[PDB]
Design an enzyme around this catalytic site. Structure first.
Site, PDB file in Angstrom:
ATOM      1  N   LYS A   1       0.598  -1.259  -0.137  1.00  0.00           N
ATOM      2  CA  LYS A   1      -0.201   0.332  -0.232  1.00  0.00           C
ATOM      3  C   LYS A   1       0.539   1.112   0.175  1.00  0.00           C
ATOM      4  CE  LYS A   1      -3.503  -1.733   2.242  1.00  0.00           C
ATOM      5  NZ  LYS A   1      -4.962  -1.602   3.183  1.00  0.00           N
TER       6      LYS A   1
ATOM      7  N   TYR B   1     -12.212  -3.921  -3.758  1.00  0.00           N
ATOM      8  CA  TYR B   1     -12.328  -3.553  -2.378  1.00  0.00           C
ATOM      9  C   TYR B   1     -14.299  -3.985  -2.691  1.00  0.00           C
ATOM     10  CZ  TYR B   1      -8.398  -2.655   0.033  1.00  0.00           C
ATOM     11  OH  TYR B   1      -7.391  -2.935   0.886  1.00  0.00           O
TER      12      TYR B   1
ATOM     13  N   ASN C   1      -2.074   0.343   6.125  1.00  0.00           N
ATOM     14  CA  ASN C   1      -1.746  -0.073   7.647  1.00  0.00           C
ATOM     15  C   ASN C   1      -0.772  -1.157   6.503  1.00  0.00           C
ATOM     16  OD1 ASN C   1      -4.173  -1.675   5.587  1.00  0.00           O
ATOM     17  ND2 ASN C   1      -4.757  -2.441   7.586  1.00  0.00           N
TER      18      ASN C   1
ATOM     19  N   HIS D   1      -2.139  -6.161   1.743  1.00  0.00           N
ATOM     20  CA  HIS D   1      -2.940  -6.519   2.037  1.00  0.00           C
ATOM     21  C   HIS D   1      -2.833  -7.976   0.990  1.00  0.00           C
ATOM     22  CE1 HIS D   1      -7.186  -8.303   0.103  1.00  0.00           C
ATOM     23  NE2 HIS D   1      -6.307  -8.797  -0.575  1.00  0.00           N
TER      24      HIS D   1
ATOM     25  N   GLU E   1      -8.629 -11.526  -6.371  1.00  0.00           N
ATOM     26  CA  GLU E   1      -7.484 -10.540  -6.537  1.00  0.00           C
ATOM     27  C   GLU E   1      -6.934 -10.654  -7.673  1.00  0.00           C
ATOM     28  OE1 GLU E   1      -7.326 -10.275  -2.520  1.00  0.00           O
ATOM     29  OE2 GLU E   1      -9.195  -9.474  -1.807  1.00  0.00           O
TER      30      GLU E   1
HETATM   31  N1  LIG Z   1     -12.163   2.055   9.308  1.00  0.00           N
HETATM   32  C1  LIG Z   1     -11.924   0.774   8.084  1.00  0.00           C
HETATM   33  C2  LIG Z   1     -11.942  -0.067   8.208  1.00  0.00           C
HETATM   34  C3  LIG Z   1     -11.675  -0.478   7.470  1.00  0.00           C
HETATM   35  N2  LIG Z   1     -10.442  -0.137   6.175  1.00  0.00           N
HETATM   36  C4  LIG Z   1      -9.685  -0.613   5.223  1.00  0.00           C
HETATM   37  O1  LIG Z   1     -10.526  -2.279   4.289  1.00  0.00           O
HETATM   38  C5  LIG Z   1      -9.142  -2.983   4.457  1.00  0.00           C
HETATM   39  C6  LIG Z   1      -9.945  -4.429   4.603  1.00  0.00           C
HETATM   40  O2  LIG Z   1     -11.382  -3.910   5.678  1.00  0.00           O
HETATM   41  P1  LIG Z   1     -10.768  -5.362   7.043  1.00  0.00           P
HETATM   42  O3  LIG Z   1     -11.532  -4.727   7.523  1.00  0.00           O
HETATM   43  O4  LIG Z   1     -11.258  -6.275   6.020  1.00  0.00           O
HETATM   44  O5  LIG Z   1      -9.679  -5.224   7.313  1.00  0.00           O
HETATM   45  P2  LIG Z   1      -7.819  -6.803   6.419  1.00  0.00           P
HETATM   46  O6  LIG Z   1      -8.719  -8.065   6.624  1.00  0.00           O
HETATM   47  O7  LIG Z   1      -7.667  -5.730   5.403  1.00  0.00           O
HETATM   48  O8  LIG Z   1      -7.414  -6.281   8.155  1.00  0.00           O
HETATM   49  C7  LIG Z   1      -8.275  -2.809   5.002  1.00  0.00           C
HETATM   50  O9  LIG Z   1      -7.171  -3.773   5.226  1.00  0.00           O
HETATM   51  C8  LIG Z   1      -8.619  -0.748   5.902  1.00  0.00           C
HETATM   52  O10 LIG Z   1      -7.604  -0.565   5.279  1.00  0.00           O
HETATM   53  C9  LIG Z   1     -10.042   1.459   6.655  1.00  0.00           C
HETATM   54  O11 LIG Z   1     -10.105   2.405   5.636  1.00  0.00           O
HETATM   55  N3  LIG Z   1     -11.251   1.611   7.332  1.00  0.00           N
END
Ligand SMILES: Nc1ccn([C@@H]2O[C@H](COP(=O)(O)OP(=O)(O)O)[C@@H](O)[C@H]2O)c(=O)n1
Ligand SMILES: Nc1ccn([C@@H]2O[C@H](COP(=O)(O)OP(=O)(O)O)[C@@H](O)[C@H]2O)c(=O)n1
Ligand SMILES: Nc1ccn([C@@H]2O[C@H](COP(=O)(O)OP(=O)(O)O)[C@@H](O)[C@H]2O)c(=O)n1
Ligand SMILES: Nc1ccn([C@@H]2O[C@H](COP(=O)(O)OP(=O)(O)O)[C@@H](O)[C@H]2O)c(=O)n1
Ligand SMILES: Nc1ccn([C@@H]2O[C@H](COP(=O)(O)OP(=O)(O)O)[C@@H](O)[C@H]2O)c(=O)n1
Ligand SMILES: Nc1ccn([C@@H]2O[C@H](COP(=O)(O)OP(=O)(O)O)[C@@H](O)[C@H]2O)c(=O)n1
Ligand SMILES: [Mg+2]
Ligand SMILES: [Mg+2]
Ligand SMILES: [Mg+2]
Ligand SMILES: [Mg+2]
Ligand SMILES: [Mg+2]
Ligand SMILES: [Mg+2]
Lengths: 132, 130, 132, 130, 132, 132
Positions: D10, D51, D110, D113, D124
């Site tokens: 990212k 996404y 973070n 991905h 993906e």
């Molecule tokens: N409040 C949030 C929650 C998720 N996200 C983004 O959405 C991605 C996917 O959400 P997720 O809860 O499945 O996170 P991961 O599976 O990537 O841990 C995350 O990696 C975040 O970068 C965000 O921008 N703001």
């Protein structure tokens, strides 16, 4: 004084798992990736073009065979005085502190190529990134 | 052979998250911290003093401008032959294996200062640690 | 150009927990361990033999005492141009990039011994690994 | 046990100079690159697709905004049990020892991905590598 | 949700040369130094204040003696959820991946203190940085 | 709570140049080398004794073949709670933070053996270092 320069990560870096290590040394010195390609196997004519100034040497054929024996990564890096700085970072197998000096011990299998002049830089970039 | 020297960690080290990396290289060569100060923003007075030998140069005020643009750490280190050895560790942007060689790429934003003589050291330690 | 060389890891490396750091630098440059011994305290005789060329110097006895004040490891290493390369890797306390350059700051306590010639290497291997 | 998975590096990784650090952690666990692409700026189309399962969430558009704010690298990796193992390597901001655990501190920025299933992966990989 | 939290680097980190290693782990996680003091020897009443909730335990006196046996560094760190995140980073000697889990093996000599609550954070900051 | 434990460094660590990386993780946690042997190829008898509890399993012979396909190092390590701590350090291929967690991805080729109990540790030390 921004320049751009061409780097190749050679097949011995994949075999020995040193790709991130080499890339990280250039990253820590504040150089930026402007473009990048991964080649599971580079086409042989690209390698031969890249090494065209070497066509009459005894090692020419063997080195091309090495370069096609595994993956390679081509990278364009940008930063101040990029050409000469990355060249110094590459160094040689007799010089501790450099990529080759710390990690290589061979005349052929030496991990990394970097452009050594402005002209070679311009030409090498056009070989691997002809969309420009 | 015991000696003390003055090191500055510059604002670019904080910007680039390289503070522990620099300090760790000095730690690894067996040099010890004798005193240390954190400055969120240094008084320009102190910077101008620290670089007084440089006051007539084209770059003088731009370099002062940068030295006040974010935090700095001043440290006194001690060990056998500390002045010359830490100065070699600092190196330059042209020589890999040194701090500036591995990590820095600019004439001005170069991460670290180390005293270059016994006279520089006595005088720089006195500036930052009266 | 395959050679063998003798390395000693000194008591200060054990004291300062630098054993793997040192061994890792040689490993990463692609040299192989051929034989190895751990000595919790080395027999004084072995150290006296090892540093015989130095018997007339004023530092001989002090050095001997230091070499016996904690553990040492004796290693035979193999690889292309091993004697000369492992020596560069060893370095000196002045120039960064090397083991001594990065990690040491003493004339006596300097972490590592490496053989410095073809003759010294054969002898030093026979002292530490007489099985021949 | 052979499997392939899709990783994104990212924009925050480029900002913070952590690209090789992330890639090196995956390299060290013996996973191999199968394909890889550098994007100086990704088409928002691709991000929205990547996404899609998230399109009804408060954070959806802000996260898309960030994903286009600087470069990204897309990589296909291969190895025994690659999907689950690389996903564990990624971890979360709460657990030290993982990529996000050691290096990241935010819900949105973070660093990385990784696909979380066989179905995510197939889909993906097809987005980024038609 | 920015917080600030109090960290101490303990005398065993100076003895073992692990100060940059510990600091670097917190730096890599994107926390910022807001203030910092070095103490060649911390005054004993500061230590005793800092550990005041521990005054009735059998280890109280001995731990204060350890904490005055060498240098310490006090740091105020700022970042999102700083208190709980740095606490997790500190971890314990049974948990690999954390500072203590990777580098410590003792009940007393465990390298690092971090505040465990908002109240303790507020109080500990006022002990070591009373100019506020 | 001082104990001793047996560690084996497996052939894959040599193959992948991970020997010092592994040894360094144990070193940094403050455990000491008490005795050490390098084996360029281990006697099959020793490996069969070492893995005796596994003689009836379907993976016994294959594993034996693997353990004999390159060098191994046998190490006795000392320190507080050494058996249980070095085991956590070893870990498994699932959880990051450990040697196996970070560096391995195979059921067979997993870099390191550590004893898992007081009884297994005494026996394993007698197999590899019978001098008693
Ligand atoms: N409040 C949030 C929650 C998720 N996200 C983004 O959405 C991605 C996917 O959400 P997720 O809860 O499945 O996170 P991961 O599976 O990537 O841990 C995350 O990696 C975040 O970068 C965000 O921008 N703001
Ligand atoms: N005897 C040789 C010399 C060079 N070479 C290869 O050809 C490349 C170009 O040769 P060179 O002398 O310009 O080396 P560098 O400029 O890359 O240092 C080397 O980096 C080697 O990979 C070889 O295979 N055999
Ligand atoms: N053109 C220049 C030259 C030096 N300087 C700054 O002035 C400091 C002292 O100059 P110098 O040539 O003695 O550099 P060093 O001794 O620090 O290598 C340098 O570290 C630079 O940060 C600058 O800002 N611009
Ligand atoms: N003044 C000295 C010089 C050397 N020595 C020791 O003697 C060893 C051999 O001396 P040397 O000058 O051949 O040094 P190297 O070849 O090991 O660099 C050194 O590595 C030191 O450990 C000493 O104790 N005092
Ligand atoms: N038996 C003990 C227990 C704790 N202590 C010390 O006192 C500190 C505070 O105790 P604690 O149980 O709150 O530990 P942490 O909260 O720091 O994990 C420990 O980190 C140890 O340095 C000690 O010296 N002896
Ligand atoms: N299916 C298996 C299981 C174990 N093994 C080997 O046998 C060793 C001992 O088995 P184990 O289940 O006790 O594993 P650890 O205690 O070493 O985790 C493992 O470390 C593997 O190297 C194997 O070759 N094939
Ligand atoms: Mg050339
Ligand atoms: Mg100067
Ligand atoms: Mg000599
Ligand atoms: Mg998800
Ligand atoms: Mg507590
Ligand atoms: Mg078992």
């Amino acid at each position: 004084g921004l320049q751009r320069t061409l780097v190749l990560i050679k097949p011995d870096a994949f075999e020995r798992s040193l790709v991130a290590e080499i890339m990280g040394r250039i990253e820590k010195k504040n150089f930026k990736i402007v473009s990048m390609k991964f080649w599971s196997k580079a086409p042989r004519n690209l390698i031969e073009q890249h090494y065209k100034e070497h066509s009459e040497q005894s090692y020419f054929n063997d080195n091309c065979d090495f370069m096609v024996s595994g993956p390679i990564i081509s990278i364009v890096y940008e930063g101040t005085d990029a050409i000469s700085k990355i060249r110094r970072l590459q160094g040689n197998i007799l010089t501790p502190g450099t990529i080759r000096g710390d990690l290589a011990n061979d005349i052929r299998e030496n991990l990394i190529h970097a452009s050594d002049s402005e002209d070679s830089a311009v030409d090498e970039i056009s070989i691997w990134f002809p969309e420009t």
